[PDB]
Amino acid sequence: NGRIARSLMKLLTILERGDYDGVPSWSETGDRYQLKLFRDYVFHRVDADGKPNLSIGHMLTCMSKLEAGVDENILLTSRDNETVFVLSYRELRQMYDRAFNELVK
Amino acid sequence: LEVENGRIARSLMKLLTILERGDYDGVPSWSETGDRYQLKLFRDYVFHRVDADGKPNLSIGHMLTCMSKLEAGVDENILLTSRDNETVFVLSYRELRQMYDRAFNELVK
Amino acid sequence: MDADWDEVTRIAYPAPGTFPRPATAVAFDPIAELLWAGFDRGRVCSFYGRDLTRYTAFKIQPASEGPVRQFLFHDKGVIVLGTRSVHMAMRRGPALWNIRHENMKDLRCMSFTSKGTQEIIVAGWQDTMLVIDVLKGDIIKQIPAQHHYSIMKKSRYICAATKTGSVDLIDPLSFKIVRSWQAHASYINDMDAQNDFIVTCGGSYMLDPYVNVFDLKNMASMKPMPFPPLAAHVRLHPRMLTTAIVTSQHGQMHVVDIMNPNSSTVRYANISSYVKLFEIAPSGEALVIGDADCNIHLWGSPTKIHFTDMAIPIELPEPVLDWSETPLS
């Protein structure tokens, strides 16, 4: 099927575009900030002492739950721990889809 | 059940672990410098392509071919461009694959 | 009132050791079992349940634009007032909207208007008041402020405390000033308005030995409620509609009945510094007192304490043999 590969490519397509510079929705007060934090949650994990946690099981599991839009909640946090969200994969899937559609139209 | 091609899925995930990571291993803006900076422009080239008028080119065919050439490290060159549009970089997938491997290995250590 | 009430929980936020800057705004959520706190540098966080466990957190403005001013609450989420902007977020954290404008210069207070929770008006130490559509996150219209305002509470009218010890009684529909009430000689330190009463603390730096009282139904001032320790903060009880709780600057609290003032109950909150914040839960079964040492003291009956009418649990994240992890390669 290859849904995860396509979802990974959608993440790369959606996130960190140069055109987002100076756009409020992608700032820490904007309504798409959680999309950056989800990327951090999955792919920029570290243990205590700061060593990258590159566990592939975590990555594929999170991407799979995202694709299925399951009701499970996860804790998204900024690096400085001053932003803390509780979001479901269900909501995150909807939010990524919204961001993607902004690129299509 | 998810069914995925191993090398393609893994190559995408490795890119994501590297890019826009920010500071790392005592190196400030590690993700934005050296080898990692080239990977940043490569992601832009593959996934943030726009045509004239600035409309996103979202071709999955283009994305898959580029990721495949990267993983295979072919001697074909590509043209990467800085975000301010001023600087152009010429390098092969072979050379990019080397930067790619180096950058990721630094996360493994 | 009750007798078994006590300090149930004390937390220090921000945590000692970074830094000694207390919350600048606090409010109990009427819909979720959450205490909301706002801080300097535009930081907000919520605390869940009787133990005040940190829940969600977000920013509402750039760090340079100072403190959080006030909270309001909507079914869709929490409205947060900053100095030069207005923010709305999900209770679970993510931003819904963020409104800035040239005429948002020094905001201090806000209130719902005549459309239930659909519309708010924001104001401050500035000559303009801005009316906002909460659902759309849009400014609807702008209205001159007759005076600079520091505090807003809403009952029958939008009650707006000025910088000169007066309260303007503003019609929520037309926004005209119906009546102005000189509650204290030179300044107002605190004000609440609930169920056709206004209550105030204030002075003539020097606080008055009473809580002044205004009858909104009959539109007349009432005999002040004596408070010898000097009244600093006051809140009306949400279930006992003629009862107020008053505290001194040092945490001496009196439960008093506006209709029978001489009858009173006295409790002492052992705070290490002076009171900064004082709020009562919509349930009337909890209150918080925050001091200048960043302590947040939660009071209530140790067995019955809860913040909202429906004390619901909230959306949270989720062995002998548990061997093993494969790194990405």
Swiss-Prot record, chain A:
Superkingdom assignment: Eukaryota
Locations listed in the record: Cytoplasm
Start and end residues of each stretch annotated as Knob domain: 14-105
Biological function: Regulatory subunit of the poly(A)-nuclease (PAN) deadenylation complex, one of two cytoplasmic mRNA deadenylases involved in mRNA turnover. PAN specifically shortens poly(A) tails of RNA and the activity is stimulated by poly(A)-binding protein PAB1. PAN deadenylation is followed by rapid degradation of the shortened mRNA tails by the CCR4-NOT complex. Deadenylated mRNAs are then degraded by two alternative mechanisms, namely exosome-mediated 3'-5' exonucleolytic degradation, or deadenylation-dependent mRNA decaping and subsequent 5'-3' exonucleolytic degradation by XRN1.
Domain notes: The N-terminal zinc finger binds to poly(A) RNA.
SUBUNIT field: Homodimer. Forms a heterotrimer with a catalytic subunit PAN2 to form the poly(A)-nuclease (PAN) deadenylation complex. Interacts (via PAM-2 motif) with poly(A)-binding protein PAB1 (via PABC domain), conferring substrate specificity of the enzyme complex.
Family listed: Belongs to the protein kinase superfamily. PAN3 family.
Name of protein: PAN2-PAN3 deadenylation complex subunit PAN3
The organism of origin for this protein: Chaetomium thermophilum (strain DSM 1495 / CBS 144.50 / IMI 039719)
Gene: PAN3
From Swiss-Prot, chain C:
Family of this protein: Belongs to the peptidase C19 family. PAN2 subfamily.
A GO term for molecular function: nucleic acid binding
Job of this protein: Catalytic subunit of the poly(A)-nuclease (PAN) deadenylation complex, one of two cytoplasmic mRNA deadenylases involved in mRNA turnover. PAN specifically shortens poly(A) tails of RNA and the activity is stimulated by poly(A)-binding protein PAB1. PAN deadenylation is followed by rapid degradation of the shortened mRNA tails by the CCR4-NOT complex. Deadenylated mRNAs are then degraded by two alternative mechanisms, namely exosome-mediated 3'-5' exonucleolytic degradation, or deadenylation-dependent mRNA decaping and subsequent 5'-3' exonucleolytic degradation by XRN1.
Highest taxon in the source lineage: Eukaryota
Compartments where located: Cytoplasm
Protein name per the record: PAN2-PAN3 deadenylation complex catalytic subunit PAN2
Gene behind this protein: PAN2
Gene Ontology biological process terms in this record: mRNA processing; nuclear-transcribed mRNA poly(A) tail shortening
Subunit structure as annotated in this protein's UniProt entry: Forms a heterotrimer with an asymmetric homodimer of the regulatory subunit PAN3 to form the poly(A)-nuclease (PAN) deadenylation complex.
GO cellular component, one term: PAN complex
Major subcellular location class: cytoplasm
Record's comment describing the protein's domains: The linker, or PAN3 interaction domain (PID), between the WD40 repeats and the USP domain mediates interaction with PAN3.
Alphabetic keyword roster: Cytoplasm, Exonuclease, Hydrolase, Metal-binding, mRNA processing, Nuclease, Repeat, WD repeat
WD repeats: 102-142, 270-309
